[PDB]
Amino acid sequence: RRKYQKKAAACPDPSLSVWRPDIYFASVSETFETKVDDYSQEWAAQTEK
Amino acid sequence: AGILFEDIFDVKDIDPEGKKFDRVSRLHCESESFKMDLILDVNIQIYPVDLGDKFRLVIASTLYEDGTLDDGEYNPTDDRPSRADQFEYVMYGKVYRIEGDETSTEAATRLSAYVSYGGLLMRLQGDANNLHGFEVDSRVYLLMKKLA
Amino acid sequence: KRITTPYMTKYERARVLGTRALQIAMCAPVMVELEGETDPLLIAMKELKARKIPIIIRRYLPDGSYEDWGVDELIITD
């Protein structure tokens, strides 16, 4: 029962929602972390080659 | 002595894309000794040049034959034995981009040099070791002298 | 801690540089040696970058309860 009812709750609420982005560092929104991640693994593999 | 490269040169065809300026020509020239390839711009007004002309080329990192790297700023009055006094054509320079080698290369044969002298473009290609010393932000002084 | 952010809010720097040019405009002690130009608009950069600002900024939180901030505690930067 516990095993199952663990994996039942949401992917937790957004970062911006629980951490006010003024105080806490690195409070990016979903469609911008995807952007920085896009470019991270898209440039490094580019530049090395 | 700081000859970063040297070669003799004669031209094959001057402008293969029309005459579309006033003070410049877009040279297409090839070496004989090594299978290099020079694309260069040369002011024909104050240095007339033709098709069948031959000239020796060098590319130094300093014009002193003491090989010291002391350069603040060209001071016009000074005179002492420099490598220019045997040539006929000077140009200051800057190399800004080297293309030909993408990845961890198993045989870097074709590598190109991209130089533009304050606005006149220059493209030279070749091997990948002869054409070394050529970092980024790498001042060179083109020199040249028409040879018979 | 503070539920504001140590960082330079442009309105703060702007308005309080106005306040400090007012300060040295009127009768006010000259902290930084006035190296020429009497105008504290040209010496305001000197004031700030030398951090001669004991000014108390009363950042007001949603209603009533405030904060006080001396401008050095921020992230004044280029």
Resolution in A: 4.1
C-alpha distances (whole Å) from C4 to each of A23, C63, C73 are 7, 14, 12
Architecture of domain B5-148: Beta Barrel (2.40)
Domains of chain C: 1-78 (3.90.940.10)
Chains C and B touch (3+ CB pairs under 8 A): no
CA nearest to C6 within chain A: A23
Q: Which residue of A has its CA nearest to B105?
A: A49
- CA–CA dist A16, A27 (Å, integer): 6
Residue C55 contacts by C-beta under 8 Å, 6 or more apart in sequence?
A: C16, C19, C20, C70, C71
| Residue B102 with chain A: CB contacts under 8 Å | 49
